[PDB]
């Protein structure tokens, strides 16, 4: 049984502290977040049907204090509805606090707060790129395994007011009907190839005509005409995805038919990128707020 209010209070009380300060939840509280959120994820569709207004964010990658700033600008749940597009952990310094606050908000406000799966919400990936090490250092391996069980149940895509298709990575040459996404059974790992892999790993590319091999070595690239055909076939207006660092935190593709959102400013302390958050109002007017890193 969770005391979700106590948990959220402790996660938020480090606001304003010298950045890097940890929240020390009890192991059983974190396990509790994983178990309860898994129940909620499985009870909701794997392809979410959402209504505007809401705010949409891309990659967070453990940048907890930047996540807190996103909520300060966007409004703390449930003042605003949120959809996150995946990649909550790895690379950054505070993945545990990041995923714990996100799961806590999912549990407290399950119809106002939504999380999609990113390619880092995958044991084979986050074992390597930081999350496993963080779990091992602060708790133990068993807790990392508990997170994996939770991540294996995250929904994969969302459609906002029947017009905006959202997922972490991108399109798939295997995808002919949304029903194919709906028939993916959870829990599941991410496969090395196939529909679910593509939805989490693929990228748009201005220099490809049709589909191409992705330079990453996983999945595909797709061109602007692929986007156009997808939108026309499914009566959609916009693809909203994440999965690529972009200078200004958001970047359009194919004459604004696709947008990439990335919400982790100065990613890895390497990229000097802004993080962006997209607001969608009830009329589906989209606007951007961007967090620019400064000295």
């Amino acid at each position: 049984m969770l005391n979700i209010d106590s948990i959220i209070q402790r996660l938020l009380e480090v606001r304003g502290s010298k950045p890097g300060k940890n929240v020390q939840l009890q192991e059983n509280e974190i396990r509790g977040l994983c178990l309860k959120s898994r129940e909620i994820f499985l009870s909701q569709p794997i392809l979410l049907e959402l209504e505007a207004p809401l705010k949409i964010c891309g990659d967070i990658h453990g940048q907890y204090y930047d996540l807190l700033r996103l909520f300060e600008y966007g409004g703390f749940p449930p003042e605003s509805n949120y959809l996150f597009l995946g990649d909550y952990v790895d690379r950054g310094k505070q993945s545990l606090e990041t995923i714990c606050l996100l799961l806590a908000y999912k549990i407290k406000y399950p119809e106002n707060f939504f999380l999609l799966r990113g390619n880092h919400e995958c044991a084979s990936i986050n074992r390597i790129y930081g999350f496993y090490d963080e779990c091992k250092r602060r708790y133990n391996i068993k807790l990392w395994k508990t997170f994996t069980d939770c991540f294996n149940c995250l929904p994969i895509a969302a459609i906002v007011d029947e017009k905006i298709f959202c997922c972490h990575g991108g399109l798939s040459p295997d995808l002919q009907s949304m029903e194919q996404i709906r028939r993916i059974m959870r829990p599941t790992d991410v496969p090395d190839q196939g529909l679910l892999c593509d939805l989490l790993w693929s990228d748009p590319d201005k220099d490809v005509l049709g589909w191409g091999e992705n330079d990453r070595g996983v999945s595909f690239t797709f061109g602007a005409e692929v986007v156009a055909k997808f939108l026309h076939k499914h009566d959609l207006d916009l693809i909203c995805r994440a999965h690529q660092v972009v200078e200004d935190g958001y970047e359009f593709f194919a004459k604004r038919q696709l947008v990439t959102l990335f919400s982790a400013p100065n990613y890895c302390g390497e990229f000097d990128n802004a993080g962006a958050m997209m607001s969608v109002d009830e009329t589906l007017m989209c606007s951007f707020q961007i967090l620019k890193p400064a000295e």
Binding site: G269, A274, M285, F288, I290, K292
Partner: peptide, 20 residues
């Protein structure tokens, strides 16, 4: 309903995000 975009972007500066 139709997706549209506001041209005005709201920008914020986050101090300390360089050299965390």
């Amino acid at each position: 309903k139709k997706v549209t975009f506001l041209e005005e972007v709201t920008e914020y500066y986050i101090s300390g995000d360089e050299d965390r």
